[PDB]
Amino acid sequence: MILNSFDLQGKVALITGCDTGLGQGMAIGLAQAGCDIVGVNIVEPKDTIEKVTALGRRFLSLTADMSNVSGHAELVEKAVAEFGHVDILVNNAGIIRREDAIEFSEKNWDDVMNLNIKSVFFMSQTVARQFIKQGKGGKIINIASMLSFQGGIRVPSYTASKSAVMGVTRLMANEWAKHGINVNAIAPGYMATNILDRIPAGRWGLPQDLMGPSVFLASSASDYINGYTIAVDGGWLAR
Amino acid sequence: MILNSFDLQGKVALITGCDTGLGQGMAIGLAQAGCDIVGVNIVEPKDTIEKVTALGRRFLSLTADMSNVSGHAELVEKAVAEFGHVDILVNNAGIIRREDAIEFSEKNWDDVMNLNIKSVFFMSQTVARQFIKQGKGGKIINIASMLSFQGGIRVPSYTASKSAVMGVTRLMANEWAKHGINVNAIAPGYMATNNTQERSKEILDRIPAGRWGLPQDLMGPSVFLASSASDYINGYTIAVDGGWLAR
Amino acid sequence: MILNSFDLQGKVALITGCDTGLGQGMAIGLAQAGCDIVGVNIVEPKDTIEKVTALGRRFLSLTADMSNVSGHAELVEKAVAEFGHVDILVNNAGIIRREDAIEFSEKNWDDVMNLNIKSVFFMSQTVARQFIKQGKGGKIINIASMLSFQGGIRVPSYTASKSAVMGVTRLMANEWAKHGINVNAIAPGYMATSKEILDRIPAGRWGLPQDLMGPSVFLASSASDYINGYTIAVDGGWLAR
Amino acid sequence: MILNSFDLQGKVALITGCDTGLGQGMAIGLAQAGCDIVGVNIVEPKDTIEKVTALGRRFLSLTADMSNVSGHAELVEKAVAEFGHVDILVNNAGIIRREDAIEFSEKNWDDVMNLNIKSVFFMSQTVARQFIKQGKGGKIINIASMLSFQGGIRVPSYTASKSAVMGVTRLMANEWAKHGINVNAIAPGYMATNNTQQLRADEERSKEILDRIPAGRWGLPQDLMGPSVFLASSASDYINGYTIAVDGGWLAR
Ligand SMILES: NC(=O)c1ccc[n+]([C@@H]2O[C@H](COP(=O)([O-])OP(=O)(O)OC[C@H]3O[C@@H](n4cnc5c(N)ncnc54)[C@H](O)[C@@H]3O)[C@@H](O)[C@H]2O)c1
Numbered sequence: 014m015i016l017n018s019f020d021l022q023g024k025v026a027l028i029t030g031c032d033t034g035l036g037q038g039m040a041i042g043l044a045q046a047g048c049d050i051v052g053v054n055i056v057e058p059k060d061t062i063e064k065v066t067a068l069g070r071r072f073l074s075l076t077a078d079m080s081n082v083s084g085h086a087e088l089v090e091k092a093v094a095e096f097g098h099v100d101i102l103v104n105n106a107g108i109i110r111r112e113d114a115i116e117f118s119e120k121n122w123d124d125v126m127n128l129n130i131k132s133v134f135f136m137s138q139t140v141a142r143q144f145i146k147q148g149k150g151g152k153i154i155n156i157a158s159m160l161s162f163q164g165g166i167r168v169p170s171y172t173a174s175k176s177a178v179m180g181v182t183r184l185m186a187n188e189w190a191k192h193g194i195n196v197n198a199i200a201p202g203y204m205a206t207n208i209l210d211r212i213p214a215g216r217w218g219l220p221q222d223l224m225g226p227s228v229f230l231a232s233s234a235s236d237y238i239n240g241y242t243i244a245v246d247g248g249w250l251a252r
Numbered sequence: 253m254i255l256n257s258f259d260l261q262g263k264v265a266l267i268t269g270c271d272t273g274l275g276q277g278m279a280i281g282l283a284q285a286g287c288d289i290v291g292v293n294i295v296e297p298k299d300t301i302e303k304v305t306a307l308g309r310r311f312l313s314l315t316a317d318m319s320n321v322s323g324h325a326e327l328v329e330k331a332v333a334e335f336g337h338v339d340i341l342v343n344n345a346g347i348i349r350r351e352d353a354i355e356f357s358e359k360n361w362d363d364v365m366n367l368n369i370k371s372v373f374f375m376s377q378t379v380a381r382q383f384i385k386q387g388k389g390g391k392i393i394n395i396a397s398m399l400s401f402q403g404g405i406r407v408p409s410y411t412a413s414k415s416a417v418m419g420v421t422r423l424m425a426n427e428w429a430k431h432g433i434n435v436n437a438i439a440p441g442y443m444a445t446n447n448t449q450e451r452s453k454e455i456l457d458r459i460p461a462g463r464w465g466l467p468q469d470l471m472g473p474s475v476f477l478a479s480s481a482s483d484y485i486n487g488y489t490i491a492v493d494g495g496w497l498a499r
Numbered sequence: 500m501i502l503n504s505f506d507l508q509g510k511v512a513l514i515t516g517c518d519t520g521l522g523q524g525m526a527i528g529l530a531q532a533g534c535d536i537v538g539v540n541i542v543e544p545k546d547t548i549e550k551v552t553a554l555g556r557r558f559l560s561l562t563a564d565m566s567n568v569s570g571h572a573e574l575v576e577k578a579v580a581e582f583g584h585v586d587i588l589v590n591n592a593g594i595i596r597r598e599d600a601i602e603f604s605e606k607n608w609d610d611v612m613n614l615n616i617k618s619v620f621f622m623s624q625t626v627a628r629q630f631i632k633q634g635k636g637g638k639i640i641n642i643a644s645m646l647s648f649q650g651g652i653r654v655p656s657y658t659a660s661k662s663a664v665m666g667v668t669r670l671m672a673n674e675w676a677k678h679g680i681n682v683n684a685i686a687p688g689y690m691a692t693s694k695e696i697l698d699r700i701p702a703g704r705w706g707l708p709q710d711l712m713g714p715s716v717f718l719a720s721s722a723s724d725y726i727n728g729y730t731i732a733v734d735g736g737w738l739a740r
Numbered sequence: 741m742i743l744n745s746f747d748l749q750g751k752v753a754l755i756t757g758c759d760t761g762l763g764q765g766m767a768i769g770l771a772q773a774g775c776d777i778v779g780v781n782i783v784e785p786k787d788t789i790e791k792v793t794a795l796g797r798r799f800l801s802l803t804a805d806m807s808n809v810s811g812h813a814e815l816v817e818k819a820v821a822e823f824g825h826v827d828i829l830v831n832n833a834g835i836i837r838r839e840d841a842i843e844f845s846e847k848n849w850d851d852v853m854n855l856n857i858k859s860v861f862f863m864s865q866t867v868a869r870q871f872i873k874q875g876k877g878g879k880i881i882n883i884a885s886m887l888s889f890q891g892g893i894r895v896p897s898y899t900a901s902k903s904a905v906m907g908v909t910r911l912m913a914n915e916w917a918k919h920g921i922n923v924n925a926i927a928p929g930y931m932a933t934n935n936t937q938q939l940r941a942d943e944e945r946s947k948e949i950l951d952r953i954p955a956g957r958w959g960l961p962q963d964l965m966g967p968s969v970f971l972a973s974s975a976s977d978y979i980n981g982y983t984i985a986v987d988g989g990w991l992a993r
Pocket of ligand 1: 344397
């Protein structure tokens, strides 16, 4: 029965950057579908923890700067100790820096790239090693952007990193499919979080809009989807 | 709770070409998710009917050449009687003709384009009107292809039609989002069906999944795109291809 | 010497739909680069002929409905008889029909598809047969749209046909590239051929027929020999935004 | 008269990585079209200098590590001092590192990203500042890849960087097109240069790729001369933010 394919009962999902907005939405969405949650945040995710534990699921709350790639192995070791396994990774921790391209600083380049693409690759690598050891496959969900498709303005490192996310998602699928690993991405549109007439849906997107697609991509219901980016954008890219 | 968003209890789904292969899979998947099915076919979908009814769901079997666009209005009327509404449409009925591009006949062009794109737009329109009348939105799922993205060989009208499907999917979402209608597409990879019956091994080694797709692989994605779980996805094509486009 | 690679002296270009605007621009640009021109139009391209012949180039004006695919072999035979060979095809003849998608007529579907994609495929087939006979390769330039990439509104058959153009361009390259035939497309942006739209064009101006002269000469020349199956946007940055 | 639009007489082009292969091809093509050339290389590009000067054009040879973004301004200042202006930038300097993704080292990440995307953005920024000062527009040509479109294997930082090139090309156009600056990219297909040397030595793999190139041949440096001149010229003035594949039909197949 196909509805069972969406059910994430007994699954363990590690979501970086889930204290608020989109990442919170996705963490709560995965918990609602049955996942226990490991969070990695720089801010304590109390509201998320309350909402996750209120569903009767567990939340392991890890505090770390995701840009420190040497730190990743331990984060995943702790998750594995606490739950026995890690099944799903959502690489949502990210930042944006706005400055005219002609003035753009090296700091505003490095900080964004270090988090939005470099740490995404290395965290995916770290978790994939654990998936392989487990031998039962795994799911990775990266977070792309409309700026994976279009250039935008004043955010060169964000556009670069998000375009890179879409590309590296393809490579990870190509290389790791043999390990039973799916790697896909969600590209949110313009979301009401920390233009409107160009959205066919006529509304801003919300964290709630990412719950369904994230459960879908985290579940057996999307097993033959791999290396692909799915726009959750109210039709932005269509117009 | 989010798992309730995938539940299609009480919905009616019209699927074209569901007697076999991919369409059969989507019809059955939609039925398992709670849908009553309306089939439109050239041959009786006997197996599909038995599997849909075995789940305690209803199946209306309509028979028609989908390429006849004047006959679409009636098919939707027949559905609205009996079931009372139509909430979901899957435009899966299609064909392919293989012939060297330099020799390609007008017949092999028209036959493919009439079904694969023309009939798809006009059926979507017909069902869209019904959606608007009903006033509670709706879902359309078109079927794209790897040949919406890549050219292939010896199938100019197929590549043309499937590329056109990806594009009209965008327009229909743009124009009809205001009516609460989501129009998306699934692009299957290389699937084991009648459509694809050592050349095989070269392709297979370029599918990261390492296996042909199956009708079962479209059940999850089709239920997803037919449900509230995908409400902010519109005008978009999702590849279900085992990583083909990634390689 | 690379500038020689852009020189189209001795070449013959068949352009459909070149009486005005973009098609006229492309025919003139090709003529400026050295091409003699064969036009196919519904009416005499009088102004285009004047401009081409003023450059010292030949113009053969054929009058026909490009949507009649049974007529193509004759059009190509006439071009080959007049000049001895045909080297370049530009499939510009096209139309658009605007009408709400929910009300869209079958006539406004058929009319647009017959010309914008069906005739494009069959004209390309017709000319490709001639290219293969000649044995010196050839060039096909199809005309795509921003609506090959985006949906638009009120023009279902236009979007269908132009999305199809981008796809069939890929397939024709796949099959014919081995013969030295290059099949590519130009996707013009918003051309002068309101403020809301300009503010989303990075270049901050409408495109002009002259903006297609360089790209069409490039894709018709030796300078683009390893480009095949590809659509090039000439859009002032529209798709980037 | 349109052929004049391709003529780069009086123009000055700065090409990074033009000692060999693709970059050398583009430098020579630009020089054949009339450009004086500024090279930025790790060693003196003797062959390229020979060929460019034989055409009657000037070659300013700069030796520098393009990954050092602090040194870019000085490179451009030298160019401007020599010729009075810089009109065209080709961001060709790049590397690739092959290693299983599951094992991929931090070094193989950083070295590739630093050159292939970071330095590309900052060199573009440096030259764009000069274009704005001059007030006569300018051309930037970035170098994408088939791996801007497809994933590949064993080269995560390459795929990341080249996908990022396609994206930043869009943004740079968005911001700078108003100044008559055109930022575009060329995506070479499978070209017979050092980067495909190992691949081409494997007879079996070589044929599997070649059989999937519709043109039925590998690309060569000469195949980028025309497209680079085009993108560096007034003939492409309404093309902006776009990546053009020079791939013999690879992406079409
Ligand atoms: N590898 C693949 O199988 C693949 C890949 C991409 C897209 N597709 C598309 O998926 C769809 C399903 O094809 P398939 O793979 O199951 O093989 P298929 O040929 O068995 O499916 C075609 C379906 O359409 C029906 N049909 C044909 N002509 C019709 C007509 N005139 N009116 C009504 N119904 C008609 C057939 O009876 C059948 O049920 C098609 O649109 C196909 O082009 C398939």
